[PDB]
């Protein structure tokens, strides 16, 4: 079972690169945009990319990028429901939200009213 983890704002997919970047793309056909969704427990998961095998992370910077290393603590998320299938997805170490920007860059931000911080997140068949 794999998602898309999709920008309500622009419709922008999230996607992990070959290069290890993470950005947002239109592209429904790129290998990046497949996640599988790891139960950690306790109300954390891991967002795991099926192309690469990273985990996502957002790191004390607000940069956001994949790693393998499943004991970084910056891996854990919680995804948090905001109704009617919107949903935010919060960094456990950081307490930063996942944002995507209309531009396709992906970071971190702390601001609630960031309209890059609301997903949708849908299955894959």
Known sequence: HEVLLRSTETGQ???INPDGTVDGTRDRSDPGIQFQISPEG???VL???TETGQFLRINPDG???GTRDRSDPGIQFQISPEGNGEVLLRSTETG???RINPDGT???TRDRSDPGIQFQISPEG
């Open 106 to 108: 992906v970071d971190g």
């Open 96 to 98: 930063q939200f996942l």
């Open 13 to 15: 997919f999230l996607r």
């Open 63 to 65: 940069t956001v990028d």
């Open 47 to 49: 967002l795991r990319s």
């Open 42 to 44: 306790n109300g954390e």
